[PDB]
Amino acid sequence: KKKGVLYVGRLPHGFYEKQMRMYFSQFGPVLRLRMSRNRKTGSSKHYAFIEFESLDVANVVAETMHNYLLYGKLLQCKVIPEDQVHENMFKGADVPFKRIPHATIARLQHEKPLSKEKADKLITRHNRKLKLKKRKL
Amino acid sequence: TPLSSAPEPKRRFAPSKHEQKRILQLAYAIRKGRILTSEQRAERER
Amino acid sequence: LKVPPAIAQFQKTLDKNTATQVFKLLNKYRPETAAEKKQRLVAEAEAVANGKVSKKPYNVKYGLNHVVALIEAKKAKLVLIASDVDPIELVVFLPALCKKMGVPYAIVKNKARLGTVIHQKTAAVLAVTEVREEDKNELASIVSAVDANFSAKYDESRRKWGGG
Amino acid sequence: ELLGSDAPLEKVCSALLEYESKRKSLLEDEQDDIEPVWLQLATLKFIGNNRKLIPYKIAIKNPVIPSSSEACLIVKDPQRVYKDLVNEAGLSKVVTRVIGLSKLKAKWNSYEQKRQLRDQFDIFLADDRVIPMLPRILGKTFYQKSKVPVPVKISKGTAEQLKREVVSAYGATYFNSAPCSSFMIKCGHVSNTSTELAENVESILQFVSKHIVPDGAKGIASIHLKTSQSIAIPLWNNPNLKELIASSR
Amino acid sequence: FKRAETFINNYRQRERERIRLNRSAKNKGDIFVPDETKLLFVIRIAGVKNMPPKIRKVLRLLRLSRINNAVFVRNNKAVAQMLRIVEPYVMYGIPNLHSVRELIYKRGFGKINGQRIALSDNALIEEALGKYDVISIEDIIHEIYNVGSHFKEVTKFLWPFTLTPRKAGYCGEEINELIKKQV
RNA sequence: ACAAUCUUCUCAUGAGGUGUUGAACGAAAAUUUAAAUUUAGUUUGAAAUCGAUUGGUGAAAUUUUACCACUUUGU
């Protein structure tokens, strides 16, 4: 009845969204799944939240998968109580992090053609800024 | 602390004397031809 | 029937996953067989018979008198006790001695499995005393797992009379 | 002269010595560490296709790494042969530890172990044939905490080459290329005087315009001199940077 | 059931394979291209679940849709590049004339009417390859060994060999020895 | 099935070798184009309890990409 939610920590590098889905579905089906990733590059934060339709299935899974010796890491599985579950803390579910390659997009705009007017806008107050720096010095 | 205060014998920081006893015994019988050497063991097999 | 706590503790053994990971480390440190020992010694014999300095060996420690002496000397990092020793009083003190000496210990299943590591039919207890530098992290992770999956688990259960 | 047909050096570098000195304002362990001199360079176009995890062997005459800094050498298997060569070359006090590649991969696997090894030495030198592996094995705990192994060529394995390479390695500044248009190069510290600092700047500029910037010094946008907390005093500005970028793009 | 460690191991292999394909494609577009052999034998060693899409497409093009499948191909720059991409899952070698004849005589089966039919009689071969000047198993073997114009048509007509039970990569003349162990 | 291909060097004299756990703390500078990449440094158990950034691009047959990254998702 009550939608239980389980927190999995210390995930070994490779136990990712696809890997958890096919594994935890053996104990019981999973419809949504989310693992935290960094804003800048999307690298896994080695911790995730997995929900379950029934609290009982979440409870038994936490029992058999707590302190699990996986890849030299003691996998931590604790059931999060409902009062600490937030509505907006499960957005972008099973969403392949669209890791924006900021290095290349900076280069593309860096290498993008710039007209004389664009260069004049690009110059802007750089001489004034240099003068301001000289005035400060 | 460890239960026993007895000093550590030198035998635990030196090559085993039991094996050296066997090595000299084996080396003797190799000279006397009692045990087949590794190089001539293979030749007898083939 | 009702069993005392010192005998009841042997029914709570290490889980399958942790035991399987424990024996992966143990199988790296098996003692050399009677055949492999003879091959190594005869090889050094020819180098002596004709004409001619090593490192300390690495292996898992076995034997009840040997292991108990290593625990008392605090030389053992991990002690694995068989769960089905035919006279139970042979190992009934080992969990208490390991607790007193601060030795991470676990009760594993199938004393035959312990014997297979040491090329013997049967071993009552295995002990890992000191491993190579490559396996320091693997042993350290196992000791942390034994702490959680055996010591943190049970514990309160091992002080209760079992059975009945 | 090479950069813009002019040499506005010496005066700025000498003035920077007094600029930082005026901004001066019991402990047991003390050291001769001095604030580094950061030579900021700006390029009109991006200079890096991708993250290159090797330093640039910018040969210099005033070393930025003091001879009191410990060194760690990484060699290919076996490590005993190169350990004997280091001892026979008189580099025991400099090259404290020689680690074979297999031993480095195995005996240092934990992140804490890698961090402990990183903090045990001040500079890391690696064989050129084993440098491409060190991106792994060493990981982010090395390449982000200002510890980039140096590609020292010891292929033939002789004592005189070891002494020359280490002296060359110590007497040089390094910079890890990254994809961007701005970067900082270590030119020295306050201990080096003005004239030596100026010599370091010009030598670095020649090296930068040769093997770093594809179009040479003509592609340099601006350059500034800075310290850890000092103001980035503009060393030089391109008189035609604005029109060059407009015409190129 | 499937243990959690298995899924990570499959993932690590997938990430391992992705980098290897990235090595071969970018900055290393050079293949060995062995010479002195116009025909080579390629056998798919093994494959894993969730294999890379590029590797599967190469296997489908090379007709290696199943493991332990042996196919004879002509040495070419395009073939070498495809072989290098699928090198981890495919073993290549230089077949021998005696080995090719033995394979055709033992496990030589063609694709007649979309079905794998053994070439037990020369009548089927003659009817299927009337325009290719092939009427017997010996003629097909000779054309394959000599790598003629109709060898490509003969290869398409011939079904892939099933050399069920090995090293990975190029095996050279040792691949012919494995044929003796299979036929 | 906790196993698998991360370079223990090549070419040509120079040019290459494309690969890094996460979290936290913390500078002051530069160009790009506040947001973005560089960027003094540091602390740590392969540590972890919302904070997913959410663009471009292809490639199978729009859901599918767990990096497809502009050079930008099945020969």
Is the distance from CB of A68 to CB of A74 less than 8 angstroms? yes
Percent helix, strand, coil in chain D (nearest 5)?
Answer: 35, 20, 45
Q: What is the CA radius of gyration of chain E?
A: 18
CB < 8 Å & 24+ apart, contacts of C131-137: C131/C25, C131/C28, C131/C29, C131/C58, C131/C77, C132/C58, C133/D106, C133/D107, C134/D106, C134/D107, C134/D109, C135/C25, C135/C28, C137/A72, C137/D109, C137/D110, C137/D113
Q: Do A23 and E11 touch (CB under 8 A)?
A: no
**SS3 call for A121:** helix
Q: Closest by alpha carbon to C8, among C122, C145, C107?
A: C107
Q: Do E4 and A19 touch (CB under 8 A)?
A: yes
Instruction: Give the CATH number for residue D165.
Output: 3.40.50.790
Using the structure, give the distance in angstroms from the CA atom of D129 to the C1' atom of F21, rounded to a whole number: 26
Contacts of C2 (CB under 8 A, 6+ apart): C161, C162, C163, C164
Q: Closest by alpha carbon to A35, among A68, A67, A5, A11?
A: A11
Measure CB to CB from residue D246 to each of A106, A119, A133 and give the nearest one.
Answer: A119
**SS3 call for E34:** coil
Determine the structural domain holding residue D103 and report its residue range: 56-173
Strands of the sheet with A68-70, listed across from one edge? A33-37, A44-52, A4-9, A73-80, A68-70
Q: What is the DSSP letter of C11?
A: G
**SS3 call for A12:** coil
**How far is the C-alpha of E132 from the C-alpha of E150, rounded, in Å?**
6
**How far is the C-alpha of D74 from the C-alpha of E12, rounded, in Å?**
28
**How far is the C-alpha of D46 from the C-alpha of D188, rounded, in Å?**
25
**How far is the C-alpha of D119 from the C-alpha of D141, rounded, in Å?**
10
**SS3 call for E3:** coil
The encoded tokens of residue D76 equal: 């290919």
Q: Closest by alpha carbon to D57, among D65, D49, D45?
A: D65
Which of E6, E8, E14 is the best substitution to test chain A (most A C-beta atoms within 10 A)?
A: E8
Please give the torsion angle defined by the CA atoms of residues A73, A74, A79 and A84, in that order, rounded to the nearest 10 degrees. -60
Using the structure, give the distance in angstroms from the CA atom of D135 to the C1' atom of F75, rounded to a whole number: 32
A-to-C residue pairs, Cβ atoms closer than 8 angstroms: 21
- Compare all CA atoms of chain E with the CA of A11 and give the residue at the minimum distance: E8
Sign of CA pseudo-dihedral E13, E19, E23, E26: positive
Is the distance from CB of C160 to CB of C2 less than 8 angstroms? no
The encoded tokens of residue D216 equal: 């040479």
The encoded tokens of residue A134 equal: 């000289």
What is the CA D2 to chain-centroid distance, rounded? 22
Minimal C-alpha gap between A33 and chain D (Å) = 29
Is the distance from CB of D11 to CB of D234 less than 8 angstroms? no
Which of B1, B5, B22 is the best substitution to test chain C (most C C-beta atoms within 10 A)?
A: B22
> What method did the depositors use to determine the structure?
cryo-EM
CB burial readout A5-37, b (16+ within 10 A) else e:
bbbbebbbebbbbbbbbebbeeeeebeebbbeb
Contacts of C105 (CB under 8 A, 6+ apart): C78, C79, C80, C81, C94, C95, C98, C99, C146, C150
CA closest to F54 C1', residue = A98
CB burial readout A57-86, b (16+ within 10 A) else e:
bbeebbeebbbbbbbbbbbbbebbeeeeee
Q: Do A22 and E7 touch (CB under 8 A)?
A: yes
**How far is the C-alpha of D99 from the C-alpha of D113, rounded, in Å?**
14
Resolution (A): 3.0
Using the structure, give the distance in angstroms from the CA atom of D23 to the C1' atom of F43, rounded to a whole number: 28
**How far is the C-alpha of E99 from the C-alpha of E93, rounded, in Å?**
12
B38 contacts in chain C (CB < 8 Å):
42-43, 46
**SS3 call for D165:** helix
**How far is the C-alpha of C162 from the C-alpha of C7, rounded, in Å?**
8
First to last CA, chain B: 59
**How far is the C-alpha of A74 from the C-alpha of A65, rounded, in Å?**
9
**How far is the C-alpha of C64 from the C-alpha of C89, rounded, in Å?**
12
Is the distance from CB of C82 to CB of C127 less than 8 angstroms? no
The encoded tokens of residue E144 equal: 């394959």
Q: What is the DSSP letter of E132?
A: T
The answer to whether A123 faces chain D, any CB pair under 8 Å, is yes
- Beta strands at A68-70 and A73-80: parallel, antiparallel or unpaired: antiparallel
Q: Closest by alpha carbon to D106, among D126, D131, D77?
A: D77
Phi-psi region of C86 (alpha: psi -120 to 50; beta: other; left: phi over 0): alpha
Touching A (3+ Cβ pairs <8 A), the chains are: C, D, E
Is the distance from CB of C127 to CB of C70 less than 8 angstroms? yes
Is the distance from CB of A74 to CB of A67 less than 8 angstroms? yes
Strand (E) positions, chain A?
4-9, 33-37, 44-52, 68-70, 73-80
Minimal C-alpha gap between C79 and chain B (Å) = 16
Q: Do D237 and A130 touch (CB under 8 A)?
A: yes
Which residue's structure tokens are 């030598």? D203
Measure CB to CB from residue E2 to each of A12, A18, A23 and give the nearest one.
Answer: A23
Q: What is the DSSP letter of C63?
A: -
